[PDB]
Amino acid sequence: MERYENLFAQLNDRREGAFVPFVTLGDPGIEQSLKIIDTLIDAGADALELGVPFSDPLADGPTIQNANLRAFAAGVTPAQCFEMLALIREKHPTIPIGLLMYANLVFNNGIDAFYARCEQVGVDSVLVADVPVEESAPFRQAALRHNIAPIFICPPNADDDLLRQVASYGRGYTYLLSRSGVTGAENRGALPLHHLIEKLKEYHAAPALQGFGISSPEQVSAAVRAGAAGAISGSAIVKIIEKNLASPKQMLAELRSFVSAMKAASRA
Amino acid sequence: MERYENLFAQLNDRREGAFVPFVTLGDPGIEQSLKIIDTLIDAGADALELGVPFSDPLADGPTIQNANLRAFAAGVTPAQCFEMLALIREKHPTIPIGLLMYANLVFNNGIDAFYARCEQVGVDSVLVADVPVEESAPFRQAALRHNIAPIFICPPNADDDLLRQVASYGRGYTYLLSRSGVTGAENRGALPLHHLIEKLKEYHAAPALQGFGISSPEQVSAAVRAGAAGAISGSAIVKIIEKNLASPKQMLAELRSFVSAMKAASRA
Amino acid sequence: TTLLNPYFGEFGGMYVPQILMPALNQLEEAFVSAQKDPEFQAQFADLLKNYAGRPTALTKCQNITAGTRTTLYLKREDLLHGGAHKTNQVLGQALLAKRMGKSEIIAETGAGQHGVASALASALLGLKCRIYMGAKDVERQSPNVFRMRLMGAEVIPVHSGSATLKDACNEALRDWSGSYETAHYMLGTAAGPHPYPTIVREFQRMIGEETKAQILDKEGRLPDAVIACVGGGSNAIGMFADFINDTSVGLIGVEPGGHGIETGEHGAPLKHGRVGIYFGMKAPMMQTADGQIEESYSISAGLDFPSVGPQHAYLNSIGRADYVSITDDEALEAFKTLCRHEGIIPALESSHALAHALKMMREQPEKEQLLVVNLSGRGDKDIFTVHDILKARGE
Amino acid sequence: TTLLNPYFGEFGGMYVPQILMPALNQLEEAFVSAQKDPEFQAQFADLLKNYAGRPTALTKCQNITAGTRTTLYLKREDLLHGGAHKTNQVLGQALLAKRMGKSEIIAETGAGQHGVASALASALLGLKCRIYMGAKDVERQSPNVFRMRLMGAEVIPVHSGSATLKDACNEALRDWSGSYETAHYMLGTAAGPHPYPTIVREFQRMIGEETKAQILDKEGRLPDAVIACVGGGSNAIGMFADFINDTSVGLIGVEPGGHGIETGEHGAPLKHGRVGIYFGMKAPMMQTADGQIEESYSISAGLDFPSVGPQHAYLNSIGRADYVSITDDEALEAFKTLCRHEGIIPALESSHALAHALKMMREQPEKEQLLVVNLSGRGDKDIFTVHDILKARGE
Ligand SMILES: O=P(O)(O)OCCNS(=O)(=O)c1ccc(OC(F)(F)F)cc1
Ligand SMILES: O=P(O)(O)OCCNS(=O)(=O)c1ccc(OC(F)(F)F)cc1
Ligand SMILES: C=C(/N=C/c1c(COP(=O)(O)O)cnc(C)c1O)C(=O)O
Ligand SMILES: C=C(/N=C/c1c(COP(=O)(O)O)cnc(C)c1O)C(=O)O
Ligand SMILES: c1ccc2[nH]cnc2c1
Ligand SMILES: c1ccc2[nH]cnc2c1
Ligand SMILES: c1ccc2[nH]cnc2c1
Ligand SMILES: c1ccc2[nH]cnc2c1
Ligand SMILES: [Cs+]
Ligand SMILES: [Cs+]
Ligand SMILES: [Cs+]
Ligand SMILES: [Cs+]
């Protein structure tokens, strides 16, 4: 979890918010995915959120559904994902890396063993999308035992009990959900509810990143202006991959321009 | 009814059974039907059974069903049938003519009026196929008032009460049903049950004609040998019409040969 | 001679070829015997309850009468095993067939519901079943053709005439006149020669009996009127019978008006035909001036018949029951309305009855009236027919 | 925190995105409140009786057990309005949706029977209904697609994944996670996140309650075993629940064996899968070595699901219930046998249960046993599927 602490300390010192792209590991293929991620980092990504392809991603809309499908078409497995993660960490020693997991992939052959593998390859956080705080005990315990930050979600209609639980249980960053629904660029989430942001700070929660439907620099700026420590964008990034499948070079150039613009907006 | 009495007296004197063909009036057209009937008579028919085309002839199998259909296709109506009957009687003053009717055609615009029309054109008997003796009172009463013989059916399993009713109510001839089922040449009826024949004679019934499935001279001979006064053949005659629709001349020649052979068999 | 009266006033009788009279008398005799046999009645009752699912519900419409003074109940024969009221009397006739030592069953069918009922009873009770069905109906009621054959019945398409119900009736009767020694003709409606109109009423009269007990329980009084479609007369006389002596209860029968009575394309002989003799009975029929039987028409195969049972002709003649007609389009609207506002998919036959009740309500929305519609069947057999119509009409 | 236990031993829970937890807690709260509300229970009871047609018959097979020591009864959920047991708990959940002030309904469906039930309840009770259905199932269960749309429901084909039930489940849940403020997710089986396995059992448990009273009345004793198919678990747990504390009564659940367990093309996770987390619950599932959820297969759309409800996983674990499998071909033979020898056309889902009971009888024909099979649905939706198979096999 220390890589997030260092990041947010550095960003705070520079009066900056974080920009954090999401992509699916191995989309559209292992080698291109590795190049995609290098381009995201070089373009100014402060951290990464990385999906392990899952058969039934129920928190995800069609864009990221199709990213999972492309990765599977390339034969991507969780083992190959961990091979990629080793390579990424080898090149980039300080960038925080979070995984976006579904429960069955973590639970499959042992929760503890899963977080152990995460620690071994140098992952910094794990967000399990279909495990609410109410079911989280064995996941967050295993995470903390292996120096992994467990990431929890603060929904728009979070009550006080939930805010206190999320603040206590989570590490690294707090996920501030922009809206209900599933992932999707077309469905724009609202402004960071200021009451949630200030309440999380009051409870000493990990710094908040806003996510879902964040697909333009204007939204990134608004998130940081509202008091969030940064913003996550997934589907907007993945749509650039999908659009340029036939043009690997154009894909990377467009990813670079987009990410640069999104990051610049976080300095506002 | 007198034309039947004279016929059977003449036939008895000559030690002969009767052969009586059935055809549908107006099948396949009015003019051809009139020629067909002239050929039946010239070939030796002792009497005629003539059908008035009806929409739903429920005592008739496919062959005579299709005869009704051909007549309707030629636009034949009951009024035109009575026009034909006038013409037939004009040419042939002594041959007995029986009509094969379904109840609705007789009941339609007055039972009495129907039998009056029969008497006017010189019809000798009427068989209403779907009126059992149990429902016959207004039909046989109207028939007798207009000097028409009402024809009743003696089925193979007729009990004694039925035999006595048929003997008392009927005139002209008694219809001796060869078998259950509907009209049809392919379905050969049995020999005249001798007990029925002798019982009808005991009760002074009108002379018996056997009908249904009689389609060969052998069957005609067997009917007369068994004690019946004669035999009726319909579908076998109608099949010759159906077979030769395209050859009016061949139709009549084949009808003539067939009827001649059937009549010869009645002399046995 | 008969044990029971074959007539209702002028109407009814036994207008069959002489060959079939013993079969009819045998059936009448077996029926009279069975009706006083407590063992028969217990077998019949047990089948109705534990196999067919009687008593059927009486459902109060919650939505389609909103804003009016009409209270409408639906007698739920659509919930009977097989999917229509036909199943009731088929169980009784099948038992009669066994009682008479017959091992084969002949049946006509139009909507295919009587065919399905005949087939299921034959499967259960060990009879060999063959069913005549007009070729037009084989198509427009095709789901029931599959159901009949899966249950092991022989389904014989009839192509003659209009290739609909009357033509199936014709073939069934022709068949029986040759096979009656081993086969029972399981006539599917309250029509044809005596004793069928009587037997079918007595084996359907639980519909009205239950309805009376249910409406008394829920409303504390008899209905103002009971309303039923009339194809041959069985579901209507089954609903009517127990109310006939309740003089305040209106009995309303609904004939199919097809494309409109004025078009001649309908199935409404009771009100628009004239008395004739056909299919073993003296009854109102659609016929030409000359007395040929006309071909009927209805969107619903089950109502598409050019005559009607004699007891309805009689009840009409003395004014005890009133008869009306409903067109294809009116029935379709009632079909849609019930699907969308009560969550019940009715047979198109039954939809004619519903349509008239909706008209009674809509025409006089402040008239206080308590109505029961006999929902004689469910509409699974009709969904493809109705869908195609609604599509060729935008919708 | 929850009011009720979300687990059955190890199995169950609430494995949904955090956003949906308030909706689940709200539903649990409304359920607990409704269960002690006499007015709710009277409304629910009235719908079950007068609208859906409860109690359903318990039918003794007269023919298919001949020459053996097996007595077999069929609990006739095929006679329920709509044509399957699904209708029972849909009426209860619809009332809960109203109680919670929701005006829209989301539902998944496979066989289309839960979809039809959802649509009919929404039509009756004034809710806007949208239904997700795998594109494969839209074809092989097409009659129910027509029925749903005629009742005014929006049917949304799902082409992703296997285009069958699990994929419809996925889309329904994705939808709800964005629309829960106005829409109630009317989950159709005893699976998914708490409180659904509990609610669905409690709203289906009249099946076993009635069965017990009926078998006691007819036989003077409890069954030796009750047998039900298991797609998600609702008709089986509805039959089982009231017998769980009757320790002498065997509880047998039948999973789909598809083309044969050895082929991997089946839907039998309870006996041939392993514990995983998916569709909001911890339960046995078909999954790859890596933990990807596998696609299931069954000839029957209603059983074609790669997991199973947690209470069945639990009952199995402690040995209170036994679970077995039946192949496509075994189910088809049971289908044919019931059609031809009892005159009942069963759902292919239910035919899996019947098939196992026939095996129990045939394998040990001199074993004295009193069995009840839950006949969860009628087979109208399957007749075209079965017909095509029998034709491509001579027959
Ligand atoms: O920009 P979008 O709309 O595509 O959203 C990108 C989000 N990608 S992610 O890894 O942070 C992410 C975070 C949480 C998710 O589900 C949960 F909230 F239920 F936990 C799913 C994905
Ligand atoms: O030779 P087939 O087999 O065609 O029979 C010819 C009979 N033609 S008919 O006019 O005598 C005739 C006689 C009686 C009929 O029905 C009834 F018996 F019910 F009254 C029908 C036709
Ligand atoms: C002709 C048929 N059906 C008639 C029918 C009728 C009309 O027949 P009755 O007049 O005999 O009830 C009414 N309702 C339903 C559901 C029906 O299926 C038949 O199923 O063969
Ligand atoms: C999946 C569906 N049906 C399941 C089903 C089932 C299996 O579902 P349960 O395990 O929940 O009873 C059994 N019997 C019938 C008639 C069914 O329709 C559906 O109708 O959407
Ligand atoms: C009762 C019984 C038999 C009858 N035949 C004619 N009317 C009758 C009344
Ligand atoms: C009219 C005629 C014959 C019938 N058989 C079953 N229902 C009918 C309606
Ligand atoms: C009863 C009520 C709530 C519960 N939460 C966990 N177990 C329970 C039992
Ligand atoms: C398994 C999964 C979901 C279902 N919805 C209705 N029946 C089901 C079975
Ligand atoms: Cs009202
Ligand atoms: Cs009619
Ligand atoms: Cs037995
Ligand atoms: Cs399953």
Automatic annotation (TrEMBL), chains A, B:
Active site: E49, D60
Catalytic activity as recorded in UniProt: (1S,2R)-1-C-(indol-3-yl)glycerol 3-phosphate + L-serine = D-glyceraldehyde 3-phosphate + L-tryptophan + H2O
Pfam families reported in the protein's UniProt record: Trp_syntA
Cell membrane in keyword set: no
GO MF: tryptophan synthase activity
Enzyme Commission number(s): 4.2.1.20
Lyase found in the keyword field: yes
Gene Ontology annotations for the cellular component aspect, listed alphabetically: cytosol
Keyword annotations of the record: Amino-acid biosynthesis, Aromatic amino acid biosynthesis, Lyase, Tryptophan biosynthesis
Cross-referenced InterPro entries: Aldolase_TIM, RibuloseP-bd_barrel, Trp_synthase_alpha_AS, Trp_synthase_suA
Pathway where it operates: Amino-acid biosynthesis; L-tryptophan biosynthesis; L-tryptophan from chorismate: step 5/5
Source domain of life: Bacteria
Stretches that traverse the bilayer: none
Description of how the protein assembles with itself and partners: Tetramer of two alpha and two beta chains.
Its job: The alpha subunit is responsible for the aldol cleavage of indoleglycerol phosphate to indole and glyceraldehyde 3-phosphate.
Family the entry assigns: Belongs to the TrpA family.
Protein name, UniProt field: Tryptophan synthase alpha chain
Gene responsible for this protein: trpA
